[PDB]
Paper text:
Here we investigated the aminopeptidase, P. aeruginosa aminopeptidase (PaAP) from P. aeruginosa, which is highly abundant in the biofilm matrix. PaAP is associated with biofilm development and contributes to nutrient recycling. PaAP contains an M28 Zn peptidase domain (residues 44–116 and 274–510) and a PA domain (residues 117–273).
The structure of full-length PaAP was solved to 1.4 Å, and traceable between residues 44 to 536 with a 16 amino acid region (QKAQSRSLQMQKSASQ) near the C-terminus, which lacked density. A short (1-2aa) β-sheet of four strands runs through the C-terminus and PA domain. The carboxy terminus interacts with the side chain of R194. Full-length PaAP had low activity, consistent with previous reports that PaAP is secreted as a 58 kDa propeptide (Pro-PaAP), which requires C-terminal processing to yield an active enzyme.
Residue numbers in the entry: 44 to 510, 527 to 536
Amino acid sequence: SICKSPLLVSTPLGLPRCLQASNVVKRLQKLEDIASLNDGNRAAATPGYQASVDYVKQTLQKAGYKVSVQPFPFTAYYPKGPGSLSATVPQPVTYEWEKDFTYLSQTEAGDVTAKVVPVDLSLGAGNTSTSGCEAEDFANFPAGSIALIQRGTCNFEQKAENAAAAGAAGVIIFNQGNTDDRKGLENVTVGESYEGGIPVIFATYDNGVAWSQTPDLQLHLVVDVVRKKTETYNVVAETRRGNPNNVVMVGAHLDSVFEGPGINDNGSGSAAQLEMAVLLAKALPVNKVRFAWWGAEEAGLVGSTHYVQNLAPEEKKKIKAYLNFDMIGSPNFGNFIYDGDGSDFGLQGPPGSAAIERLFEAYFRLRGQQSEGTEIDFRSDYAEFFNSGIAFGGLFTGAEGLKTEEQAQKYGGTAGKAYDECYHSKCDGIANINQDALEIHSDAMAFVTSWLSLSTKVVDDEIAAAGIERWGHDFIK
Ligand code: NA
Ligand code: NA
Ligand code: NA
Ligand SMILES: [Zn+2]
Ligand SMILES: [Zn+2]
Ligand SMILES: [Zn+2]
Ligand SMILES: [Zn+2]
């Protein structure tokens, strides 16, 4: 009733009043029901994702929006079982899955036994290895061997594809070892676009050093995964009203990991943004508001990156600001605002990102809540907007990091536990939501979206004055 009036939903203090976490939770329950009917997940290239798309689309159509379901090619990747790695020559040694070695995400499967050949290594503290980054590194590389490659400088995908082009049967990339914190296993990917055709694993630095100095070494490596070329979808809609040349865009990825329902990650952002879009159907914005639900974020930001890269330059220039909402209901939440001004972590977003951050900061302060910065190093769907020079910001309640004592004093909850203990897990379901955090973060999403829908001047002022290790969850280099 009252929240159908343009006088409420058009303005920054009216829209949050109308956007209730309890109503967002009803949408989260629908996503939970979808997961339960579709093998327990809403992952890219699954019926659970398709049913999520259908729900978002129908909801938007019922609220009066035209909806664009935008397909894009997508190579799905699924680990089927643990990997194996053993030395056969000069002496039999069994290496330990998830201790000595792990998979590169998006690797091909394989079962390979071959001589191990090091490629352009530069060992030791402080090294600036470029191992495997240039085709010349593989001059005189014997086809059929396993390439032993050191992390450094360029993307894992480039190292592995260069090895494949030299006829390698498999690739072992070991951590760089230039600092003490770069010697263990890490979450690493060859990218959804990997086309090397051969298996690729990651190993600890010390294992790489020792293997590189073992004469006659042969390793037997088994990678048990499946890749499948298919497609997935973004869902895009925009208000009929508002300046089409000054678009305020909001996004939230709609896919989960395969491991679970993805209710906090990222049902929370998807559902809050959907409630906001439904409310904004009755608003009278000055600037057009565009809403995107991204596919395949968990595979390396594939949907959001595809959307931005495929916009005609004229269309890209019309997007003035991008706001990203990825995980905003964490049970053990902190109040995190993207650090667009680099005040905390030294990485600055494109001009206008500071103004967006300041809007979120001021809103949290007005509500009597504390907040703090979080990193913007290409961890979610703003990445390609950032890369394209578009001002951006966003909100986050925390994932696998452990809450600090100071944060427990500011936000409550439990110090020493993850902000979200069900991150990327089967338990990321309907119970894995803090409704107080969801309420405040949805309120702030609504306030800043509505503010910018009336005036982008704070962003425009910074644009006028002005004159990559990860890509999503995994490290690309
Ligand atoms: Na080289
Ligand atoms: Na692709
Ligand atoms: Na990952
Ligand atoms: Zn997410
Ligand atoms: Zn995630
Ligand atoms: Zn900051
Ligand atoms: Zn509220």
